[PDB]
Amino acid sequence: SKFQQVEQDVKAIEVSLSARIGVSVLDTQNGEYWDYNGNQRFPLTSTFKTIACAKLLYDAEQGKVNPNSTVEIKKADLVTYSPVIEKQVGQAITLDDACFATMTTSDNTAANIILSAVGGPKGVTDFLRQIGDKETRLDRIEPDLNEGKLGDLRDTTTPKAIASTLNKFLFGSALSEMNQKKLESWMVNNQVTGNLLRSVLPAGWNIADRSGAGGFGARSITAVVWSEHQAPIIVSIYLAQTQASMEERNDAIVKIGHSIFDVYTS
Amino acid sequence: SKFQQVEQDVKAIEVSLSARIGVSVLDTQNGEYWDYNGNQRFPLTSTFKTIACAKLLYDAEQGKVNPNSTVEIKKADLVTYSPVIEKQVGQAITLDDACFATMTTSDNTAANIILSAVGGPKGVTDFLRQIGDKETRLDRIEPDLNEGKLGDLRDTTTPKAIASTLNKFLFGSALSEMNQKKLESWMVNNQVTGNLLRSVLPAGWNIADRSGAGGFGARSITAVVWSEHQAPIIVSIYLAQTQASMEERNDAIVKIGHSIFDVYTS
Numbered sequence: 001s002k003f004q005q006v007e008q009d010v011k012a013i014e015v016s017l018s019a020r021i022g023v024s025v026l027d028t029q030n031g032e033y034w035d036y037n038g039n040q041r042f043p044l045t046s047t048f049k050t051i052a053c054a055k056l057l058y059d060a061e062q063g064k065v066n067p068n069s070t071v072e073i074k075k076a077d078l079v080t081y082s083p084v085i086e087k088q089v090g091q092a093i094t095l096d097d098a099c100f101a102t103m104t105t106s107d108n109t110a111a112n113i114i115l116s117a118v119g120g121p122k123g124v125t126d127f128l129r130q131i132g133d134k135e136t137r138l139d140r141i142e143p144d145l146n147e148g149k150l151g152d153l154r155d156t157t158t159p160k161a162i163a164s165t166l167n168k169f170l171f172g173s174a175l176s177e178m179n180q181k182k183l184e185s186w187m188v189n190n191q192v193t194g195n196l197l198r199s200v201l202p203a204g205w206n207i208a209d210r211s212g213a214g215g216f217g218a219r220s221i222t223a224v225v226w227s228e229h230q231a232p233i234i235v236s237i238y239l240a241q242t243q244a245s246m247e248e249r250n251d252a253i254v255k256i257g258h259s260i261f262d263v264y265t266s
Numbered sequence: 267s268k269f270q271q272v273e274q275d276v277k278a279i280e281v282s283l284s285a286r287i288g289v290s291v292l293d294t295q296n297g298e299y300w301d302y303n304g305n306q307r308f309p310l311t312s313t314f315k316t317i318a319c320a321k322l323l324y325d326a327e328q329g330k331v332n333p334n335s336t337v338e339i340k341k342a343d344l345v346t347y348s349p350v351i352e353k354q355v356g357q358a359i360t361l362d363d364a365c366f367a368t369m370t371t372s373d374n375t376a377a378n379i380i381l382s383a384v385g386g387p388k389g390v391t392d393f394l395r396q397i398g399d400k401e402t403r404l405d406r407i408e409p410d411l412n413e414g415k416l417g418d419l420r421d422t423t424t425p426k427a428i429a430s431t432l433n434k435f436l437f438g439s440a441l442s443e444m445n446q447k448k449l450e451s452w453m454v455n456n457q458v459t460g461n462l463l464r465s466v467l468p469a470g471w472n473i474a475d476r477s478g479a480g481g482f483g484a485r486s487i488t489a490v491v492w493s494e495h496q497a498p499i500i501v502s503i504y505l506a507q508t509q510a511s512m513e514e515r516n517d518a519i520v521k522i523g524h525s526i527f528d529v530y531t532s
Contacts, residue, residue, distance in 0.1 A: 081517040083465035087524060105465045191460030198457065199349035199371045213513065246512045247479065251347040258353060 003034045006259040010036050013252045019217070019242035021252070024159035025260055026167055029231035038160040041135075042238035043148040045212030046106050047162060047222045048124070048138055048155070053099040053186060054169045055118040055127050057179040067096040071113050079142050082109035103186035103210070108142040115141055131168050135161035146214030150241060163236035166222055170208070171232065184208050187224070195250050197223050197235065197257040202265050205230065217242035219249035230264055269300045272525040276302050279518045285483070285508035287518070290425035291526055292433055295497035304426040307401075308504035309414040311478030312372050313428060313488045314390070314404055314421070319365040319452060320435045321384040321393050323445040333362040337379050345408050348375035369452035369476070374408040381407055397434050401427035412480030416507060429502035432488055436474070437498065450474050453490070461516050463489050463501065463523040468531050471496065483508035485515035496530055 003025070014021045022037040059065050070092035073085055084101035085093070086109070093101075093110075095117050102110040118124065121138040128136045138145065139154035147155075157165075170180055187208035201207050209223035220238040237256055239249055269291070280287045288303040325331050336358035339351055350367035351359070352375070359367075359376075361383050368376040384390065387404040394402045404411065405420035413421075423431075436446055453474035467473050475489035486504040503522055505515055 081513050081520070083461075083520045083524075086521070087466060105461065191464065194457030194460060195349075195371065200353060247347050254347070254349045255352070258349075 002032075002263055003260075006034070006256065006263065007036060009255055009259045013239075013255065017217075017239070017242045017244040017248060017252060019244065019252075020240045022159040022236075022238040022240075023256060023260075024163040024234075024236040026163050026234040027231070028167065028171060028234065035160050038236075039158050041153065041156040041158060042220065042240045043146065043212070043214055043218045044136070044138065044155050044157050044162075045146050045148070045214040045218050045220060046111075047157070047210055047212040047220050048145070049102050049106065049111050049114075050166065050169070050183070050187065050210045050222065051128065051136070051138070052111065052114045052118055052124050053103055054175065054183055055124060056095055056099055056114055057182060058127070058175055059118055061176055061179065065095070065117055067099075068094050070094050071098070071117070073109070077109060077112070079108045079112065082107045085109035085113075099186060100189075104189050104191050106192055106211075112142050121145075128165065131165065131172075131174055133161050133165045136165060146218070148215030148218040148240060150216070157238075159236040159238050162222055163234045166224065166236075167234050170224060184224075193221065196221050196253050197225070200254045200258040200261060201225065202227070202261055204228070205261075213246070213249075216240065217244055217249065219246075219253065221253060225261070233260075233264060235260055268298075268529055269526075272300070272522065272529065273302060275521055275525045279505075279521065283483075283505070283508045283510040283514060283518060285510065285518075286506045288425040288502075288504040288506075289522060289526075290429040290500075290502040292429050292500040293497070294433065294437060294500065301426050304502075305424050307419065307422040307424060308486065308506045309412065309478070309480055309484045310402070310404065310421050310423050310428075311412050311414070311480040311484050311486060312377075313423070313476055313478040313486050314411070315368050315372065315377050315380075316432065316435070316449070316453065316476045316488065317394065317402070317404070318377065318380045318384055318390050319369055320441065320449055321390060322361055322365055322380055323448060324393070324441055325384055327442055327445065331361070331383055333365075334360050336360050337364070337383070339375070343375060343378070345374045345378065348373045351375035351379075365452060366455075370455050370457050372458055372477075378408050387411075394431065397431065397438075397440055399427050399431045402431060412484070414481030414484040414506060416482070423504075425502040425504050428488055429500045432490065432502075433500050436490060450490075459487065462487050462519050463491070466520045466524040466527060467491065468493070468527055470494070471527075479512070479515075482506065483510055483515065485512075485519065487519060491527070499526075499530060501526055 024035040024038040124138040136157040145155040211221040290301040290304040390404040402423040411421040477487040
């Protein structure tokens with residue numbers, strides 16, 4: 001009812017882009033929550049990277065791996081779109097650095113590194129199960145995980161499932177406060193999402209975010225927004241199976257974000 | 267020779283993406299300059315926005331229009347991807363604000379506003395002619411200027427021509443120092459290009475940039491980079507007529523940028 005307008009904006013976009021669109025919104029202050037197609041499956045694309053760097057930090061707390069330990073970059077390890085790591089062939093990087101890279105620029109080689117240090121796609125999925133995400137699953141590394149094929153279960157989440165997961169990572173007790181704060185910073189210091197929700201963020205609000213794009217037009221973001229008076233709100237927006245232009249898909253996300261934000265500013 | 271490697275990276279990309287790629291690089295300290303297909307035509311897409319906000323500032327210096335004067339946003343004026351302006355239907359905006367918006371987020375409605383206050387696509391083209399750009403031309407407003415059709419002359423530049431234009435705007439005398447500094451800031455405070463040259467910028471270097479995407483896979487950036495020891499270098503990269511994914515096109519730009527940057531750091 002509160003989110004009626006959001007719903008109409010979503011329905012319009014779903015028509016104009018001939019797409020599948022999924023949205024979920026969690027208000028942490030009270031326990032209000034809203035979804036459109038919140039149970040449908042969409043490809044994670046790069047929205048997954050949050051989960052693997054939350055694993056790294058968790059697994060470090062348990063003493064199973066050192067984030068100041070360095071991996072060595074070989075030319076043949078490189079995949080499409082690795083700005084940070086392609087500058088460093090024949091140098092070593094701290095996993096800590098590699099998470100900074102993949103969370104802030106979405107460097108894909110850096111993501112593959114992080115994945116190898118936390119038990120692969122199966123490690124990430126097991127982890128999700130242990131915090132009580134029952135839907136989200138990683139199955140492949142970069143770049144094939146972006147394939148985004150219809151009816152393919154691999155590398156998918158639901159808007160609601162990942163919104164809950166992100167809720168628990170940042171505000172639940174799975175992680176130490178310091179490590180929650182680190183993960184927050186990675187997401188707050190994201191450099192590659194100014195064209196999405198940040199571009200419609202109310203003045204003075206904060207935002208921690210992670211976005212995704214891939215195949216058959218998949219486009220998504222998962223974000224936390226908060227402010228002096230507004231307790232954390234978790235937003236999860238996934239598009240898929242569209243031929244819209246990236247620009248059209250980005251436009252869809254900032255319209256939906258603005259409606260969502262409007263709910264909480266009037 | 268110095269740029270041999272850059273050239274090989276460009277040739278590779280041109281093959282892998284089955285694309286037309288154009289590059290131009292101006293070193294302002296000495297007068298060195300380099301291009302690949304630097305005379306070929308490519309669509310401006312959003313790389314044009316710089317020219318129209320340089321017009322606004324120039325035309326203000328001449329007393330022909332006030333940048334603290336406000337236009338009124340009507341719902342029916344809105345075009346695809348206008349984050350700032352869609353937040354403000356039934357409010358007024360200073361042209362100054364509208365340039366900030368279109369230069370920092372690439373809001374398209376804001377660009378159309380700026381265009382209407384500087385004599386339209388014909389005003390922009392006349393202006394380019396008067397600073398001695400003979401190739402660059404704007405012919406349409408948003409969004410049709412992004413059409414990027416083969417052999418279409420409208421809304422095109424050459425890598426070299428726009429690189430020279432940007433050179434003159436920032437470092438020539440067409441504009442007052444204060445207004446050069448304003449235009450610099452608009453470009454320095456660009457929020458929507460972290461995934462391009464910024465993601466491979468050498469530590470401590472500065473960057474002022476404006477990027478573009480549109481039709482039949484057009485992708486471009488025009489940027490100035492400088493530092494304590496490195497005098498301004500102007501970079502102009504244009505891709506066109508490709509079916510590559512946005513991610514592939516972004517990857518192409520950061521590879522080429524890194525080669526270019528490498529020239530000047532070893």
